[PDB]
């Protein structure tokens, strides 16, 4: 159970943006094909947010709302990735997690082999 | 369309007996299983290919042969009374919980 | 009785290094390759079938390593830019796309250092006042391509070593996976020109009857689908301005080249693609994608992502690097020319190699390019758990992994080894 | 490899007709390195097969006689059952599980035993 | 190559007498590279010639029997006309225009046809 | 090399039994370079020995007949005197002083003279 | 390849030239002198540069390496 390092928790006012980082060890980063981001609001199941490809910075999203408000990036010199969320609402209060996939072939499906601890993002008055 | 669904959702258990969980999904394909305790990220138990994930002491296994996948949980050990989820690529199940 | 035979026509899948061959130093220094046979015709193997997998095919991996190695072999001895990685004071000459920048240059193969100026693109500039540094004048090494070295793709043929053979799948509309029922064999593959591009594939082979789309797993959104057209869509691209070049002495034996002047006015590079052919092309693609996805409305929704090398369409032209705005192409939807502004860059993060970059010398204006446009690299945009609301699938342009450009051609070939010995029972002494 | 398309019975003539090796000989700076290695490999593969024929008591022949009876414990088929219908590609699939046994038997019966008898005949 | 100085008739014995190959075998860091390449080439040339003899039904022989009649459509000369007076160097000048035809004929008549007949004799 | 432990008489069967070459073929970036060179050497040594057998009138045989009488001017021993007691390692110690003479004689008597007679028989 | 200040010692075929040498495997650069032939000198005052201290690269033969033609 290798842990990834995330930016911390905090509270934002509606309309605010948040920078969610996720740093890992150089080898852990290099052996990862995809960086996945997920959301788990209290009382909710796990929602897939999207992914950023570790080499190209290419992206894919779950909801179109994330496609419009969430920027998923990667930095190969820093061995980091970020989830930049703009336009925060109270409905976005959740624990956000970064995770990484080491799997690369057809027929394997998607994986969360590596995990950060999650960050709690609270949006309120 | 709800692509992936999970059940029983809520399970009434008696430790020492073996439990089972299942998921069904549109378009078939391989699917993984994960479990979490409150405050923690979920751990992988089952690879999408039904292979056991590293770190698990031979407690979880299952098969498909349809759009459904079912796994069992050895002896309902309380140590694993976690919230379980299925994953089919971009879709997740709503999850289930094991309770005594 | 066990009878021994030699010359038994059997084979097994095998991996071996393929021999380079040519039709007859740049990057593709094929004068080092062996010319192919005249009339290099194949053998049709009647009643022979074979099982192919374009996403397992190691021929792509070998090709990948040769193109990287050749690029480095040719760039290795060239003038470094690195000695010029200083902070410069620059002015603004669409605004100021090309800027006249200056510094008290500390190379100039002399102790008596001097002020000198050069013309650079803003695209390669990191602001640092009106001072700046180049994007790879940070933690990476920049070398300039030798002015004597062109890229020149050249069709390259790969040949099996003796004792080996290449099996080719000629089965119409084959998707690169599973059994092929039309199999023939060659010593050598056809010549495939290296293509350096993203989003849209350039001149290469076409589909036999209709556009066909291939994927290792179509339902896995982490994979790119390769679209092969049965007809091409021609595009012309230009740099409608004139320029001059200037040299800077970096080392006693090496000169670095930058733009010396902008001649005539400044004009944007751009491409012009037939609108009719493009529109028909996307309708045909959407039709086939609908068959793959049964019956959903399909839309093209422009590119997205971070780095412009992925987001913009890219291609080589002569020794020049173009990035084009394909938002004007990947549009609209079906459920039944076009002008693309472009940008020219001088610093290239080729192969997306961390820690290294190439600098391209000036071509002095008058850039004239053309291509066939033979296919697309697409990814699906998304999906997630939803409360039975709506549908429609959308696609975006993709790229950055050169192995897919190669795979789009190599999908028809497999390498096997020949095993001429075996036995069978008969009767004998 | 055109012969690959027919049966092994048909190949009683097409192996012979095909004849030509596609290995070394008559068929035969990163690119310079790879080309040299490819040439060396073709030679190595060629000689490995020729050495096997030699040790079995065979020579530069397309068809070679043995001194080993076929063993039905390996594969029990009539001759017509294999020569007709089946191809060489299909045939070797079973022989892969017996090839090592077969080769050791060929060496002893056809060559080692015969050469020892010939030495005695020469001295006699 | 001392034999080069006489006629091909004289060479009916001097080819045999010469015997020794001047190719590979018994005769056999930029300089290290060139030496390795030279060694590989000698091997390749050697094997190409040996493989040709094998496919023709010939073996490690200096003189080899065929099953192909000489064709006067290639070159019509009496035997004395070539064996006397003419040298091997001179002789090959005409044969260069027929060599490919000759080789294909040698393979079929001397080896392919004979081996198929022998297989039948072995089963019989 | 297990056969090394016995006499050359015992080896009348153990040479044959051993059979397998430990040279090339069936037995077969500084490390890449050394490995390629080693492979080339195995080939060269293999072919040198095979070419010698060929020129002597020998082929892919473990035991080969000559047309040269043994000369007691080299080493005068009874046959039992060498086949019993002595090993092959010991035997070659004397033959090293005669090997060159022996090889030249083998080429002429067994191959060159015989091939010239066969050519005459073929024309006859 | 620096510009040096040189004196004249058939005239001055071999000359004693000097400079504040910037190599000397040190930060504390120093004046040093050397004897050179005029044949290798381009005048640049009494200053000069060597003929290949222009747009070309000069390497010195290793002192341990002779040419030795050898047949
Ligand atoms: C993306 O990646 C996924 C993997 O994650 C691929 O999914 C696999 O797709 C193949 C092809 O469809 C699936 O293979 C199928 O398996 C069936 C086995 O189950 C049978 O028996 C059970 C018994 O309990 C029944 O419940 C079930 O309904 C079935 O009867 C086969 O039956 C399928 O077809 C074969 O049998 C029928 C029988 O009449 C024949 O007609 C067919 O010709 C054929 O012989 C078929 O073999 C495989 O199971 C999928 N994997 C998983 C894990 O589900 C995706 O295909 C891939 N997508 C793309 C586009 O590449
Ligand atoms: C697809 O086809 C195009 C069309 O041939 C290939 O590239 C183009 O090749 C022509 C060759 O004549 C280039 O023309 C150049 O003109 C300058 C003018 O002075 C001349 O000096 C050069 O020697 C050359 O003739 C043209 O610029 C070039 N265009 C590009 C985009 O490079 C193209 O390479 C083919 N692509 C593939 C993947 O096959
Ligand atoms: C291709 O060229 C277009 C140029 O039109 C590039 O994208 C464009 O970027 C501008 C600036 O952000 C967008 O305009 C903005 O729209 C918002 C909407 O509310 C407005 O608030 C801003 O003030 C501004 O007007 C413009 O819409 C956008 N156009 C497109 C088509 O996205 C585009 O990125 C280039 N693409 C490539 C691959 O080069
Ligand atoms: C390409 O991507 C853009 C977005 O990046 C797509 O435009 C978006 O389309 C949706 C659906 O039509 C728009 O939502 C609608 O907005 C109207 C505005 O009053 C609202 O009344 C509707 O209830 C709904 O919310 C969304 O605003 C629009 N976004 C932008 C920036 O225009 C575009 O359609 C995509 N292209 C294709 C071919 O799908
Ligand atoms: C396999 O594909 C080949 C494609 O080359 C088919 O053969 C070609 O048929 C056309 C018909 O006019 C000829 O002009 C080509 O010259 C043929 N090719 C060759 C190599 O001769 C072939 O028939 C197909 N086979 C099957 C079983 O579909
Ligand atoms: C994709 O197609 C749409 C639909 O034609 C384009 O939107 C139109 O753009 C023209 C430009 O002058 C406007 O006059 C129309 O009113 C727009 N239509 C709508 C419904 O707003 C869109 O711009 C195209 N995208 C790109 C990148 O060209
Ligand atoms: C492919 O298979 C077919 C039959 O399975 C072969 O056709 C046979 O060809 C022989 C040749 O003389 C005929 O005598 C048979 O009667 C044919 N069979 C039938 C059913 O007509 C065909 O030759 C095979 N292809 C190859 C390359 O061998
Ligand atoms: C060079 O040519 C001459 C003649 O053209 C050769 O001389 C002949 O040698 C044979 C050897 O027994 C004699 O029988 C002939 O009578 C000689 N001819 C004449 C005209 O005297 C000479 O041997 C040739 N050289 C070589 C190397 O063969
Ligand atoms: C080592 O030497 C001993 C004797 O010098 C060999 O023993 C002989 O083995 C044969 C085998 O049948 C017997 O017939 C002899 O009677 C044995 N000799 C004695 C004196 O008992 C022994 O085999 C040799 N080792 C090897 C590897 O040959
Ligand atoms: C070098 O990288 C650092 C990383 O943040 C960046 O801040 C800095 O501006 C970069 N410099 C250049 C010239 O790109
Ligand atoms: C496309 O891929 C599927 C994979 O099972 C294969 O069955 C089908 O035959 C392929 N298409 C063609 C034209 O071969
Ligand atoms: C797609 O469906 C909409 C639904 O109203 C229709 O208006 C549109 O014309 C359809 N597109 C095509 C190409 O038929
Ligand atoms: C497209 O392919 C054809 C094939 O012959 C070629 O002649 C042409 O130059 C290529 N390029 C363009 C832009 O048409
Ligand atoms: C949302 O989920 C509920 C669950 O029962 C379902 O009944 C409903 O039909 C779903 N969606 C819509 C749009 O009604
Ligand atoms: C081999 O025998 C089977 C028996 O049913 C037959 O179906 C098949 O077509 C035969 N194959 C050939 C090549 O004759
Ligand atoms: C060959 O015959 C010609 C005929 O005139 C003669 O002149 C020539 O000397 C002869 N050559 C030899 C080697 O006998
Ligand atoms: C060989 O003969 C000598 C004679 O004394 C004897 O001592 C020796 O043991 C014999 N060796 C063998 C292997 O018999
Ligand atoms: C370098 O070359 C230029 C060319 O004219 C010449 O004027 C200058 O003096 C040269 N410098 C040296 C040191 O030779």
Strand partners for B63: B70
Among A34, A57, A60, select the one facing C379 at the smallest CB separation.
Answer: A60
C170 lines ligand 5 (CB under 6 A): yes
Q: Which helix (H) or strand (E) holds G32?
A: strand G30-37
Q: Which residues of C touch D24 (CB under 8 A)?
A: 162-163
Q: Please choose from E3, E5, E85 the residue to mutate so as to test ligand 8's pocket, defined by most ligand atoms within 8 A of CB.
A: E5
Question: Residue B31: which residues within 8 A CB-CB, separation 6 or more?
Answer: A109, B4, B23, B25, B48, B69, B86, B87, B88
Helices (H) and strands (E) in chain D, counts: 6, 1
> How many angstroms from the chain centroid is the CA of residue C103?
36
C131 lines ligand 13 (CB under 6 A): no
CB C88 within 8 A of CB C132: yes
Q: Which residue has the tokens 């879709």?
A: B91
Instruction: Count CB pairs under 8 A between chains B and C.
Output: 24
Q: How far apart are the CA of D76 and the centre of ligand 9, in A?
A: 44
Retrieve residue B58's tokens. Answer: 């031979």
* Paired sense of beta strands B10-12 and B96-99, if any: parallel
Q: Is C178 helix (H, G, I), strand (E, B) or coil?
A: strand
**Contact between chains at A59 and C216 (C-beta distance less than 8 A):** no
Cα–Cα dist C233/C313, whole Å: 15
CB E123 within 8 A of CB C427: yes
C48: left (phi over 0), alpha (psi -120 to 50) or beta: beta
Q: Is D38 exposed, middle or buried (0-12, 13-18, 19+ CB in 10 A)?
A: buried
**Contact between chains at G1 and C249 (C-beta distance less than 8 A):** no
Question: For residues E50-80, b (16+ Cβ closer than 10 Å) or e, as one string?
Answer: bbeebbbbbebebebebebeeeeeeeeeeee
Question: Residue D45: which residues within 8 A CB-CB, separation 6 or more?
Answer: C163, D23, D24
**Contact between chains at C222 and A77 (C-beta distance less than 8 A):** no
> How many angstroms from the chain centroid is the CA of residue C115?
39
Cα–Cα dist C392/C376, whole Å: 20
Quick one: resolution in A?
A: 4.2
Among A45, A47, A62, select the one facing C383 at the smallest CB separation.
Answer: A62
CB atoms within 10 A of CB A77: 10
Q: How far is CA B88 from CA A103, C381, F49, in A?
A: 14, 16, 65
Nearest listed ligand to the Cα of residue D80? 15
Question: For residues A21-53, b (16+ Cβ closer than 10 Å) or e, as one string?
Answer: bbbbeeebbeebebbbbbbbeeeeebbbbbbbb
Cis peptide before B8 (omega within 30 of 0): yes
φ/ψ of G64, rounded to 5, equals -90, -5
Please report the DSSP string for chain F in residue order: -GGGGSBTTTHHHHHHHH---SSSTTT--HHHHHHHHHHHHHHHHHHHHHHHHHHTT--S-SS---S----TTT----HHHHHSS-BHHHHHHHHTTTHHHHHHHHIIIIIIHHHHHHHHHHH-
Q: Is A66 helix (H, G, I), strand (E, B) or coil?
A: helix
Distance from the Cα of B3 to chain C's closest Cα (Å) equals 7
- The candidate with the shortest Cα–Cα distance to A112, out of A103, A100, A97, is A100
Q: Kindly identify which residue of chain C lies nearest to residue E116, measuring between CA atoms.
A: C5
Helix E30-55 × helix F30-55 angle, to 10°: 40
* Paired sense of beta strands A10-12 and A119-123, if any: parallel
B100 touches chain C (CB under 8 A): no
Chains that touch E (3 or more CB pairs under 8 A): C, D, F
Helix F30-55 × helix D30-55 angle, to 10°: 40
Experimental method: cryo-EM
Q: How far is CA C66 from CA A27, C27, C74, in A?
A: 26, 10, 12
Retrieve residue C110's tokens. Answer: 């002399």
Q: How far apart are the CA of C46 and the centre of ligand 5, in A?
A: 11
Q: Do chains F and D touch (3 or more CB pairs under 8 A)?
A: yes
C236 lines ligand 5 (CB under 6 A): no
Cα–Cα dist F39/F54, whole Å: 23
Strand partners for C20: C158
- The candidate with the shortest Cα–Cα distance to C7, out of C323, C358, C424, is C424
Q: Which residues of F touch E46 (CB under 8 A)?
A: 47, 51
Q: How far apart are the CA of C381 and the centre of ligand 4, in A?
A: 15
CATH assignment of the domain containing B19: 2.60.40.10
Half-sphere exposure of C8 (CA within 13 A, CB side): 25
Among C220, C352, C380, select the one facing A55 at the smallest CB separation.
Answer: C352
C382 touches chain A (CB under 8 A): yes
Retrieve residue C359's tokens. Answer: 């600098």
**Contact between chains at E59 and F55 (C-beta distance less than 8 A):** no
Cα–Cα dist C36/F107, whole Å: 42
CB C407 within 8 A of CB C4: no
Cα–Cα dist D116/A36, whole Å: 73
φ/ψ of B23, rounded to 5, equals -135, 145
Number of separate domains in chain A: 1
* Optimal mutation site among C423, C428, C429, interface E, most CBs of chain E within 10 A: C428
Q: How far apart are the CA of B46 and the centre of ligand 1, in A?
A: 20
Q: How far apart are the CA of C273 and the centre of ligand 2, in A?
A: 17
Please report the DSSP string for A16-49 in residue order: --EEEEEE--HHHHHT-SEEEEEEE-TT--PEEE
Among C111, C112, C253, select the one facing G56 at the smallest CB separation.
Answer: C253
Cα–Cα dist C95/C98, whole Å: 9
Nearest listed ligand to the Cα of residue C325? 3
C74 touches chain D (CB under 8 A): no
Cα–Cα dist D93/D99, whole Å: 10
Q: Is D122 helix (H, G, I), strand (E, B) or coil?
A: helix
* Optimal mutation site among C1, C3, C10, C427, interface D, most CBs of chain D within 10 A: C10
C221 touches chain B (CB under 8 A): yes
Please report the DSSP string for chain B in residue order: ---EEEE-SEEE--BTBPEEEEEEETT----EEEEE-TTS--EEEE-TTSPBPTT--S-EEEE-SSSEEEEEEGGG-GGG--EEEEEETTEE---EEEE-
CB C425 within 8 A of CB D82: yes
Cα–Cα dist C246/C116, whole Å: 10
Cα-trace Rg, chain E: 18
CATH assignment of the domain containing A6: 2.60.40.10
E29 touches chain F (CB under 8 A): no
Chains that touch B (3 or more CB pairs under 8 A): A, C
Distance from the Cα of G42 to chain C's closest Cα (Å) equals 15
Cα–Cα dist A20/A12, whole Å: 13
Among C10, C16, C47, select the one facing D88 at the smallest CB separation.
Answer: C10
Chains that touch A (3 or more CB pairs under 8 A): B, C
> How many angstroms from the chain centroid is the CA of residue D105?
14
* Paired sense of beta strands C43-44 and C11-13, if any: unpaired
Cα–Cα dist A19/A22, whole Å: 10
Among C33, C47, C424, select the one facing D8 at the smallest CB separation.
Answer: C424
Q: How far apart are the CA of E81 and the centre of ligand 16, in A?
A: 10
Among C217, C304, C385, select the one facing A59 at the smallest CB separation.
Answer: C304
Retrieve residue C265's tokens. Answer: 């006015």
D119 touches chain F (CB under 8 A): yes
- Cα dihedral value A69, A74, A78, A79, nearest 10: 120
Question: Residue C182: which residues within 8 A CB-CB, separation 6 or more?
Answer: C169, C170, C171, C172
CB D60 within 8 A of CB E59: yes
Q: Which residues of B touch A48 (CB under 8 A)?
A: 90-92
Domain that includes residue A108, residue range: 1-125
Cα–Cα dist C376/C214, whole Å: 11
Q: Is C348 exposed, middle or buried (0-12, 13-18, 19+ CB in 10 A)?
A: buried
Q: Is C220 helix (H, G, I), strand (E, B) or coil?
A: coil
Cα–Cα dist C142/C134, whole Å: 10
Q: Which residue has the tokens 């940070």?
A: C138
Cα–Cα dist C57/B50, whole Å: 26
Quote the strand ranges of C208-253, DSSP E: 212-214, 225-228, 235-251
Instruction: List residues near ligand 14 (CB under 6 A).
Output: C 387-389
Quote the strand ranges of D1-124, DSSP E: 63-64
Retrieve residue B69's tokens. Answer: 């996948």
Q: How far apart are the CA of C122 and the centre of ligand 3, in A?
A: 19
For chain A, give the longest Cα–Cα distance.
46
CB atoms within 10 A of CB C221: 20
- DSSP for residue G28: S
Q: How far is CA C156 from CA C159, C185, E44, in A?
A: 10, 18, 25
CB C209 within 8 A of CB C174: no
Question: For residues G40-66, b (16+ Cβ closer than 10 Å) or e, as one string?
Answer: ebeeeeeebbbeebeeeeeeeeeeeee
Q: Which residue has the tokens 């690119």?
A: D31
B96 touches chain A (CB under 8 A): no
C225 touches chain A (CB under 8 A): no
Number of separate domains in chain B: 1
A1 touches chain B (CB under 8 A): yes
Question: Residue F33: which residues within 8 A CB-CB, separation 6 or more?
Answer: none
């Amino acid at each position: 159970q290798v842990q990834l390092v995330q930016s911390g928790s905090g509270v934002k006012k509606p309309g605010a943006s948040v920078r969610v980082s996720c740093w890992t060890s150089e080898d852990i980063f290099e052996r990862t094909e995809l960086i996945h981001w997920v959301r788990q609001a209290p009382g909710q199941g796990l929602e897939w947010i999207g992914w950023v490809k570790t080499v190209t910075g290419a992206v894919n999203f779950g909801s179109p709302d994330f496609r419009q408000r969430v920027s998923l990036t990667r930095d190969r010199d820093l061995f980091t990735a970020h989830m930049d969320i703009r336009g925060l609402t109270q409905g976005d209060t959740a624990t956000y997690f970064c995770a990484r996939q080491k799997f690369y072939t057809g027929g394997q499906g998607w994986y969360f082999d590596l995990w950060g601890r999650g960050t709690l993002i609270v949006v309120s008055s | 369309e709800i692509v992936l669904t999970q059940s029983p959702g809520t399970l009434s258990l008696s430790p020492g007996e073996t439990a089972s969980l299942s998921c069904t999904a549109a378009s078939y394909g391989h699917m993984t299983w994960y479990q979490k305790k409150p405050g923690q990220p979920p751990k992988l138990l089952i690879f999408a290919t039904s292979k056991r994930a590293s770190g698990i002491p031979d407690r979880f296994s299952g098969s498909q042969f349809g759009k459904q996948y079912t796994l069992t949980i050895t002896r309902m050990e309380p140590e694993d009374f976690a919230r379980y989820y299925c994953q089919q690529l971009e879709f997740f199940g709503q999850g289930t919980r094991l309770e005594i | 009785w066990v009878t021994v035979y030699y010359g038994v026509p059997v084979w097994k899948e095998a991996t071996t290094t393929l021999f380079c061959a040519s039709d007859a130093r740049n990057v593709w220094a094929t004068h080092a390759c062996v010319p192919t046979d005249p009339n290099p015709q194949e053998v049709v193997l009647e009643n022979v079938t074979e099982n192919f997998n374009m996403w397992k095919n190691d021929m792509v991996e070998q090709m990948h390593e040769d193109i990287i190695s050749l690029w480095d072999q040719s760039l290795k001895p060239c003038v470094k830019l690195t000695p010029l990685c200083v902070t410069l004071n620059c002015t603004d000459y669409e605004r100021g796309e090309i800027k006249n920048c200056s510094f008290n240059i500390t190379t100039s193969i002399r102790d008596k250092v001097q002020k000198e100026y050069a013309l650079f693109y803003k695209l390669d500039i990191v602001p640092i006042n009106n001072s700046y540094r180049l994007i790879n004048c940070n933690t990476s090494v920049i070398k300039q391509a030798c002015p004597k070295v062109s890229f020149e793709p050249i069709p390259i043929h790969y040949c099996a070593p003796a004792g080996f053979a290449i099996l080719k799948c000629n089965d119409k509309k084959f998707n690169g996976t599973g059994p092929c029922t039309n199999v023939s064999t060659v010593q050598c593959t056809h010549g495939i020109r290296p293509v350096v591009s993203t989003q849209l594939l350039l001149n290469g082979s076409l589909a036999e009857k209709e556009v066909v789309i291939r994927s290792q797993n179509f339902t896995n959104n982490a994979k790119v689908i390769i679209v092969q057209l049965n007809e091409s869509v021609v595009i012309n691209c230009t740099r409608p301005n004139n320029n001059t070049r200037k040299s800077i002495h970096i080392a006693p034996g090496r000169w670095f080249y930058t733009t010396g002047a902008i001649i005539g006015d400044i004009r944007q590079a751009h491409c012009n693609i037939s609108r009719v052919k493009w529109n028909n092309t996307l309708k045909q693609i959407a039709t086939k994608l609908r068959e793959q996805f049964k019956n959903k409305t399909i839309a093209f929704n422009q590119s997205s992502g971070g780095d412009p090398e992925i987001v913009m369409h890219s291609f080589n032209c002569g020794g020049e690097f173009f990035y084009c705005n394909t938002t004007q192409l990947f549009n609209s939807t079906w459920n039944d020319h076009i002008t693309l502004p472009c940008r020219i860059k001088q610093i290239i993060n080729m192969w997306q190699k961390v820690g290294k970059a190439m600098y391209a010398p000036p071509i002095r204006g008058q850039i004239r390019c053309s291509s066939n446009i033979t296919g697309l690299l697409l990814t699906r945009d998304g999906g997630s758990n939803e409360n039975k609301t709506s549908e429609t699938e959308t696609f975006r342009p993709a790229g950055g992994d050169m192995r897919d450009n190669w795979r789009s051609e190599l999908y028809k070939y497999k390498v096997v080894k020949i095993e001429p010995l075996g036995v069978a029972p008969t009767k004998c002494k | 490899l055109g012969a690959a398309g027919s049966t092994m019975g048909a190949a009683s003539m097409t192996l012979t007709v095909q004849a030509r090796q596609l290995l070394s000989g008559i068929v035969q700076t990163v690119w310079g390195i790879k080309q040299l290695q490819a040439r060396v490999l073709a030679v190595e593969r060629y000689l490995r097969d020729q050495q096997l024929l030699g040790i079995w008591g065979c020579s530069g022949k397309l068809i070679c006689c043995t001194a080993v009876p076929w063993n039905n414990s390996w594969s029990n088929r009539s001759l017509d059952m294999i020569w007709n219908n089946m191809t060489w590609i299909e045939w070797e699939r079973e022989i892969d599980n017996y090839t090592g046994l077969i080769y050791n038997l060929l060496e002893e019966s056809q060559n080692q035993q015969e050469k020892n008898e010939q030495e005695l005949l020469e001295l006699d």
